[PDB]
């Protein structure tokens, strides 16, 4: 169970190129299930029902009171 369950914010909008990638939009919230190689991270949408791959250089890990 390699999952961290860390939320993240969408800094910029991104579109998937494969049939296994997830879409992203500036201001959109996502949950990074776990980091993956190739510079791709598996995250899910807000609905929590849609999961896929998202860019790491396009999102920003959110924290409760840390930086």
């Amino acid at each position: 169970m390699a999952i961290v369950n860390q939320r993240a914010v969408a800094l910029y909008d991104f579109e998937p190129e494969n049939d296994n990638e997830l879409r992203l939009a500036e201001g959109d919230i996502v949950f990074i299930s776990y980091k993956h190689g190739q510079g791709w991270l598996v995250a899910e949408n807000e609905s929590g029902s849609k999961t896929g791959l998202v860019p790491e250089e396009f999102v920003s890990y959110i924290q409760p009171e840390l930086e």
Binding site: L11, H36, Q38, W40, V42
Partner: peptide, 16 residues
């Protein structure tokens, strides 16, 4: 695993 990306991730803009 289910997902399997095979390509270089994009890059952010310069403005922001």
């Amino acid at each position: 695993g289910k997902f399997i990306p095979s390509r270089p991730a994009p890059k952010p803009p310069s403005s922001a």
